Ligand code: MET
Ligand SMILES: [Cl-]
Ligand SMILES: [Cl-]
Ligand SMILES: [Cl-]
Ligand SMILES: [Cl-]
């Protein structure tokens with residue numbers, strides 16, 4: 567009734583929501599955060615009706631989820647970007663890549679494709695022109711003989727000792743104890759197309775609960791919380 571149940575991955579959405587509880591209480595609502603540890607279940611729960619909203623994804627991921635699963639869900643206002651970061655225990659600069667080196671990448675086709683294009687933009691390889699999805703099979707030039715290890719996203723943090731470098735979502739990196747200042751060698755450009763945001767059932771588009779959530783999530787308090795906790799790795803888009 568006056569309870570809002572939001573599903574979220576701990577970092578950054580879960581902890582942001584937790585610190586916004588008092589502000590939500592000021593709007594006359596109680597907030598409960600349901601923790602999820604993966605990118606699949608939060609949307610199921612949302613479409614099932616178990617949660618009022620979720621905070622873990624960007625709109626492109628949601629659109630792909632809607633296409634594959636037929637969820638009746640929707641992206642809200644852009645909140646913050648979480649640029650992909652390339653981590654390494656073995657080198658400090660992308661200039662230090664050499665023959666035989668291995669990069670761990672997600673087996674998600676969109677993430678994989680996007681990661682390969684990041685590596686292209688820094689001159690490490692070349693891909694065919696266009697905007698379609700690319701894979702390691704499509705690499706035209708590969709000067710430094712970089713091999714790619716395609717893994718489940720949950721496995722990538724623990725792979726860092728066994729590979730040269732790895733692309734890891736901040737949602738996975740931070741709870742795994744990875745420090746981007748210490749071990750990050752490349753951060754992806756800011757692109758608000760990939761801004762994480764609140765998602766909710768299309769039916770609840772104009773409901774007060776979603777309205778309350780998006781108010782507090784775009785507040786000055788929300789901005790300062792993001793900046794104070796993540797300092798550079800999660801960037802507000804409001
Ligand atoms: C579940 S879509 C990926 C979300 C992740 N925090 C990112 O922006 O990279
Ligand atoms: Cl809670
Ligand atoms: Cl319905
Ligand atoms: Cl309703
Ligand atoms: Cl203001």
Ligand SMILES: [Zn+2]
Nearest residue numbers: 581582584585
């Ligand atoms: Zn806290």
Ligand SMILES: [Zn+2]
Nearest residue numbers: 588589592787
């Ligand atoms: Zn207040």
Ligand SMILES: [Zn+2]
Nearest residue numbers: 584598599600
């Ligand atoms: Zn809680």
Ligand SMILES: [Zn+2]
Nearest residue numbers: 602603604607
């Ligand atoms: Zn899970």
Ligand SMILES: [Zn+2]
Nearest residue numbers: 615767769770
């Ligand atoms: Zn309903």
Ligand SMILES: [Zn+2]
Nearest residue numbers: 618770773775
């Ligand atoms: Zn509702």
Ligand SMILES: [Zn+2]
Nearest residue numbers: 657658659662
């Ligand atoms: Zn060095």
Ligand SMILES: [Zn+2]
Nearest residue numbers: 659660661688
């Ligand atoms: Zn350089």
Ligand SMILES: [Zn+2]
Nearest residue numbers: 785786787789
């Ligand atoms: Zn202000």
